[PDB]
Amino acid sequence: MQIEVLIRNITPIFSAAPGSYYVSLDGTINPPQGASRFPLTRARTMTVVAETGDGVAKAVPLPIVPGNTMRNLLRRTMLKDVIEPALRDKSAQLSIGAYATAYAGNSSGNPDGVPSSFDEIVTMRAHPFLGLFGGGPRMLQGRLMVDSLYPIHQFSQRIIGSDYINDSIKGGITEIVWTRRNDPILQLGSPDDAAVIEGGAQAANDWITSLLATTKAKKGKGRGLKAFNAHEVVIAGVKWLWRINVDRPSESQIGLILLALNKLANQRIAGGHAKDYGRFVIEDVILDGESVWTPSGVSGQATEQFFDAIAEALDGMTSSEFEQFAAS
C-alpha cells in the first residue's frame, strides 16, 4: 500500500548536519584563514546525481530530511495522539521494557533475545501499532517502509518523479540564519535592574571584572555567555513529497497510519523547537493512486473501513499486548 503525502512547510525545516562547519559574515561557507570564521550548522544534504546545467550527470547536494527522522516522527505522532490516550483511557501502565520498545524499539527490557513462535509472530505482526514498527527484544521486521522527505526540486526529479513538476523549485532553497547570545549582566543600566540580584552592584562588578580578565587572557594566548554564530536552514514554502509504503497491511494498521496523518500537522519536522522550525501543513494524501485528502483531514467513503477498524482496535487495546510484544 503506497501513501503519497504532499507536505508544504510553513516555517523553515532545520535538520542539523553532523560536523563543525564554518562561515564568514559575507556568507562564504568554509571561509579561508584570512577572514573571520563563525561556526555553522548546515542542513542535512544528500549527494544525488542530476542533470544540472544541461549536464549528463552531476553529483549535487540536495537538502532533505532523513528517513529515520520521518519514521520517528510518525511513531511519536501515533504514540502521543492515538496510542497513549487510548491506553490512558483504560488506565494502562507500561514497564520500562514495554515503554522503551514502544517509543524507540529498544531491546533493553529483555536483551537476552527471546524466540518467537510462528503463532506469536502472526498475532504480533498484526498489532495495529507494534506491527508497523518492529523491534524490542524480539526485534521483528516492521511492515512500515517510510522514505525520506525529498523536496520537490530540479535535482530530485529522478527520485520523486515528474508527477509533481508544477511545484518544483529551480534555484537553491537553503538560507543562513544568524544567532547571537548576549551576556545579560552587561545590559544592566540602573540599580533598579540590579535590585533582583542578591549581590546588587557588587556581584555585577565582579562578573564584569571576571569577564574582562578572561577576555584579556584569551586575547593574550572558562567560556563566557557571549556567542555569535549561524545555522543553515531550508527556506520556507518549499513543497516536499513523503512516500510511505506498508507491506501487507491490515485494516487496523492502515487506519492508524491515516489517524497519524490526520494528527501529523500538529507535530514538527526535524529540529528547531525553540525557533518554531519545521511547521508544515499537509496538502494532499494519495492512497494507491487515489486522492483522499479532504479539507477536513483524511476522510471519504473509501477510508471509513480503516477508521472503523482502528477505532475497534483502540477500543480493545490493552497494555498486556505491549508487555507480550516486549517479552516483559
Partner: protein, 222 residues
C-alpha cells in the same frame, strides 16, 4: 539452463553492502515474500527460499551453491557516509513517569547505556547500477524481480529504490557466475580471478553466523 545477466537501476541511493550482495539471496527473499503473500506470516522462511529458478553447483564434498554471482557495484557517485541516531525523548518519558504511564523508579536517564541510551551509527550510501550474472530461467527471474522494490538494506528508511531492472542473455565469455562465495574445494578452472579464503555462508541467509563456513570469497568483489 540458460546464462543470464541481471541489471538493476536505482531511483534512490542504497546502503553500500559491507560484504558480498548475492543475487540468489535477493531472489530467495523475493520468493519468501511471494509465499508470504500467498500463505501468510506463519510460514517457515527456510522452507521456501531454495525454490529459485537457478541451477546449482555441487563440489566434491557435497557443498553446493547457487550459480548466481554477487552483485557488481559500480558507483555513479562517491559514497556518502549517512548518519542516524536513536534516542528516547527524556522530557516525554519524564512526563509519562509522573503520570504513571511508565513504571520506572530510576531517578535519571543514562545516555551512555540502558533504556535511554543515545546511540550514533553510520552506513554508506551509494548511487550504483547493480549487475550480476546467473544461470537460470529468464522469465521466472524477471517475474521475481518485478516485485522487488528496494535493494541492499536499511529498507525501512527507504534506501535503494528500484527505478528499473533488465535481464539479458549474454555469452558465457563475458563474465561467469563464480563471483560469489564458493565452497572450499571448488575447482580452480571455474573461478574468475583471485579467491581469498574466508568465513562466509554458502546458502541464504548469509547473516546467520551459525551457518558460516570457510569459503573462497572473491578478493576483487568484497
Amino acid at each position: 539452463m540458460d546464462f543470464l545477466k541481471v541489471t538493476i537501476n536505482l531511483g534512490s541511493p542504497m546502503v553500500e553492502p559491507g560484504d558480498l550482495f548475492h543475487l540468489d539471496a535477493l531472489l530467495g527473499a523475493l520468493r519468501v515474500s511471494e509465499v508470504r503473500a500467498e500463505l501468510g506470516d506463519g510460514i517457515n522462511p527456510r522452507d521456501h527460499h531454495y525454490d529459485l529458478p537457478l541451477e546449482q553447483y555441487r563440489s566434491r564434498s557435497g557443498q553446493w551453491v547457487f550459480k548466481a554471482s554477487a552483485f557488481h557495484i559500480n558507483k555513479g557517485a562517491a559514497s556518502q557516509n549517512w548518519m542516524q541516531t536513536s534516542r528516547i525523548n527524556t522530557a516525554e518519558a519524564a512526563r509519562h513517569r509522573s503520570e504513571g504511564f511508565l513504571l520506572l523508579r530510576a531517578a535519571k536517564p543514562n545516555p551512555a547505556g540502558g533504556p535511554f541510551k543515545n546511540s550514533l551509527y553510520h552506513y554508506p550510501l551509494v548511487w550504483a547500477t547493480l549487475t550480476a550474472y546467473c544461470v537460470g530461467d529468464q522469465a521466472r527471474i524477471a517475474d521475481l524481480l518485478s516485485q522487488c522494490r528496494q535493494i541492499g538494506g536499511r529498507r525501512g528508511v527507504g534506501c535503494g529504490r528500484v527505478a528499473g531492472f533488465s535481464v539479458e542473455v549474454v555469452p558465457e565469455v563475458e563474465c561467469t557466475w563464480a563471483l560469489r562465495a564458493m565452497p572450499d574445494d571448488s575447482e580452480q578452472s571455474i573461478l574468475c580471478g583471485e579467491y581469498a579464503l574466508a568465513m562466509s555462508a554458502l546458502q541464504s541467509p548469509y547473516w546467520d553466523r551459525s551457518l558460516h563456513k570457510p569459503a573462497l570469497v572473491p578478493t576483487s568483489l568484497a
